[PDB]
């Protein structure tokens, strides 16, 4: 069995819809739902946790004073189930704030470290869903990268654009986020790491097996 954290940006900017089209939030939710549906249908043994960042509430083991705010553990590590599908589909909504992505990653790693203690997992994995529109502190990257490698946690990113034609009007913050994603994934697995960054559209096409 594996352990997977779905680390989903639900911050305010995720709710923006281009001309009524689907917002990044709805696109990310659809990818998460297709993944969870396949896991449940197959009776997979993998355990799935869900961390949301950008929530109006704060609920996580690291939260103190003004640290790790607006990050919430929606589902601790366990088998996915029909309750989770209903919650992701019909309960989870966008927040009205932004949270720091790297703090959400730290919360996700800490959750995996704590909740896999004394258990046997083949792999530990974190999947990030975001549009990279909000700021983060680049200095804490060194510790995060080191801890990911020590813990043998692998990463995937799911975005509304490629990390490599017509430009998409990306903000300077989104471009900085792109550089951060490339830095993390390259440190973790070189050039192959960069191929673990996907668009929502590509992921939906791969995962849309129920029709």
């Amino acid at each position: 069995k594996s352990a997977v954290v779905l680390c989903m940006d639900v911050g305010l900017a995720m709710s923006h819809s281009n001309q009524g089209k689907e917002s990044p939030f709805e696109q990310a939710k659809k990818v998460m739902m297709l993944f969870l549906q396949r896991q449940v249908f197959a009776e997979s043994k993998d355990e799935i946790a869900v961390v949301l960042y950008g929530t109006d509430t704060t609920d996580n083991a690291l939260a103190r004073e003004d640290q790790y705010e607006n990050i919430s553990v929606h589902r601790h590590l366990m088998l996915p189930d029909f309750d989770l599908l209903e919650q992701i589909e019909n309960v989870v909504e966008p927040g009205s704030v932004q949270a720091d992505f790297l703090d959400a990653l730290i919360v996700s790693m800490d959750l995996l470290q704590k909740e896999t203690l004394g258990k046997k997992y083949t792999r530990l994995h974190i999947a990030v869903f975001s549009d990279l529109s909000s700021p983060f502190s680049v200095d804490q990257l060194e510790v995060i990268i080191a801890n990911l490698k020590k813990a043998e946690i692998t990463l995937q990113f799911f975005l509304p654009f490629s990390v490599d034609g017509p430009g998409k009007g990306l903000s300077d913050q989104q471009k900085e986020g792109i550089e951060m994603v490339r830095k993390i994934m390259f440190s973790l697995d070189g050039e192959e790491g960069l191929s673990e960054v996907f668009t929502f559209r590509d992921a939906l096409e791969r995962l849309s097996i129920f029709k």
């Binding site: 997977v4 993944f35 999947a127 995937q156 673990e196 992921a203």
Partner: peptide
């Protein structure tokens, strides 16, 4: 890999 595992 990952979610496509």
């Amino acid at each position: 890999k990952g979610l496509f595992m």
